Design an enzyme around this catalytic site. Structure first.
Site, short mmCIF file in Angstrom:
data_model
loop_
_atom_site.label_atom_id
_atom_site.label_comp_id
_atom_site.label_asym_id
_atom_site.label_seq_id
_atom_site.Cartn_x
_atom_site.Cartn_y
_atom_site.Cartn_z
N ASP A 75 9.47 2.51 6.77
CA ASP A 75 8.32 3.21 6.15
C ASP A 75 8.80 4.06 4.97
O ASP A 75 9.29 5.20 5.16
CB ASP A 75 7.62 4.07 7.20
N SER A 94 1.57 3.24 -12.50
CA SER A 94 1.28 1.90 -13.01
C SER A 94 0.53 2.00 -14.34
O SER A 94 -0.21 2.95 -14.58
CB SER A 94 0.44 1.09 -11.99
#
Ligand code: 478
Length: 330
Positions: free
Chosen positions: A35, A199
Site C-alpha cells: 500500500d 497530472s
C-alpha cells in the site's frame, strides 16, 4: 541488494493485490496488501481477537526465534474507507522476494474492523508511503522500504500491476525489459506523507486532450481511480445510460455497454487506460447494472490514482533524497 516478488489479484475483478512476505525465523509466509498510500506494516496474528479472524494466515511471534517485543509500543490506524486496526509491536526479520530487513517493526493486530475479517485473502498490509505517516507510539517506526533503502543498489521500487493477471514489485533496480518507450519522471510533494504528484490533463476515448493540472496520490492500495467530479462526469457522459447513484455510492453503467478508454498526462507523455480496465462488474450477483472504475473524489479530499490507473503503466517510486515518480507505457 535487490528483491523481486510477484503480486496477484485477490479475485476476478482485481479488487486488490496480494504479495507473499516472509516474517520471522523459521519463516512465516503471509500474503500482504502492498500500500503506497499508508506506512504501517501490520498483520493478523496469534494476538488477534479470535472472533475477528476468519480464514487469514496469522503471524505467531512466540514461534519466531528472532522476534522481540518492542516494549511499550502500540499502534492504531483508520483508513479512508472507515476500516481500522490496532495492536502491539514486535521487531523481526522480514524478507520480500530475496530482500531482507532485520529489525523491521511488525505491528501485530489485537483488533481489526469487520471489512478486514470478512476478506479472507488479505493477511495484513505493508505500507510504502513515507514513514512520517507511521502510527506507532510513542516511538514512530520506519517502513520496509525506508529500512532497506541504503542497502539497495538504487533507492527505488517499482510497481508493474496486471489487468486480471499477476504482476511484479521490484526493489533496488529498474527492469528495462518491462515497459515500452521511455519513463517520464515527475515531481513529488511529501508534505502530506504520500507520493503526491500533478497530472497534466486527460482525454476520454478518442476525444480532445484537456490540459489541466490534477493533484493526486499514486496509491497501490486503492482499487479505483478517484478524480474531480468535472472529469468523471465528462467520462461517463460517453457511456449511454451511465449515472451517479447515491444509493449504490457512485457511477453505475449498463453491463451491456462498451467502455471508452481514459488517458492521463504525465508531463508531455500519455498513459492510456483501456476501457475494459474500468469495468468492475455487477453491483450485486445477477444484476445488469455494473460498477464503474472511475469515480468522483468529492468528499475524499484528495484525488487518488489507484490500481485502475497504475496497472496501465510501469511505475517507478524513486526514493532519492528528492523523491520523484516515473511512469512508462507497457
Ligand atoms: C486498507 C487500505 C486498502 C486502505 N485504503 C488505501 C490507503 O492507501 C489509504 C488511501 C487514502 C489516503 C487519503 C485519504 C483517503 C484514502 N490511506 C489511508 O487511509 O491512509 C491514512 C492512514 C495513514 O495516514 C492516512 S482505502 O483507501 O481505505 C481503501 C479501502 C478499500 C478498498 N477496496 C480500496 C481502498
Amino acid at each position: 541488494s535487490t528483491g523481486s516478488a510477484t503480486t496477484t489479484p485477490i479475485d476476478s475483478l482485481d479488487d486488490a493485490y496480494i504479495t507473499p512476505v516472509q516474517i520471522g525465523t523459521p519463516a512465516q509466509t503471509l500474503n500482504l496488501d502492498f500500500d503506497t498510500g499508508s506506512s504501517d506494516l501490520w498483520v493478523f496474528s496469534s494476538e488477534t481477537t479470535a472472533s475477528e479472524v476468519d480464514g487469514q494466515t496469522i503471524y505467531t511471534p512466540s514461534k519466531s526465534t528472532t522476534a522481540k517485543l518492542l516494549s511499550g509500543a502500540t499502534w492504531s490506524i483508520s483508513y479512508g474507507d472507515g476500516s481500522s486496526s490496532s495492536g502491539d509491536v514486535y521487531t523481526d526479520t522480514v524478507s520480500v522476494g530475496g530482500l531482507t530487513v532485520t529489525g523491521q517493526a511488525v505491528e501485530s493486530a489485537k483488533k481489526v474492523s469487520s471489512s478486514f475479517t470478512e476478506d479472507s485473502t488479505i493477511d495484513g498490509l505493508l505500507g510504502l508511503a513515507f514513514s512520517t505517516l507511521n502510527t506507532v507510539s510513542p516511538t514512530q517506526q520506519k517502513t520496509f522500504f525506508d529500512n532497506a533503502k541504503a542497502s539497495l543498489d538504487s533507492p527505488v521500487f517499482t510497481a508493474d500491476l496486471g489487468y486480471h493477471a499477476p504482476g511484479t514489485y521490484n526493489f533496488g533496480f529498474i527492469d528495462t525489459t518491462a515497459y515500452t518507450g521511455s519513463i517520464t519522471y515527475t515531481a513529488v510533494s511529501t508534505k502530506q506523507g504520500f507520493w503526491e504528484w500533478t497530472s497534466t490533463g486527460y482525454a476520454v476515448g478518442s476525444g480532445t486532450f484537456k490540459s489541466t493540472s490534477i493533484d493526486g496520490i499514486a496509491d497501490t492500495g486503492t482499487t479505483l481511480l478517484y478524480l474531480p467530479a468535472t472529469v468523471v462526469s465528462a467520462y461517463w457522459a460517453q457511456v449511454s445510460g451511465a449515472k451517479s447513484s447515491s444509493s449504490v455510492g457512485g457511477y453505475v453503467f449498463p453491463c451491456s455497454a462498451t467502455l471508452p478508454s481514459f488517458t492521463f498526462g504525465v508531463g508531455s507523455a500519455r498513459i492510456v487506460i483501456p476501457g475494459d480496465y474500468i469495468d468492475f462488474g455487477p453491483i450485486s450477483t445477477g444484476s445488469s447494472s455494473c460498477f464503474g472504475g472511475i469515480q468522483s473524489s468529492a468528499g475524499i479530499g484528495i484525488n487518488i490514482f489507484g490500481d485502475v490507473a497504475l496497472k496501465a503503466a510501469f511505475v517507478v517510486f524513486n526514493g532519492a533524497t528528492t523523491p520523484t515518480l516515473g511512469f512508462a507505457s507497457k
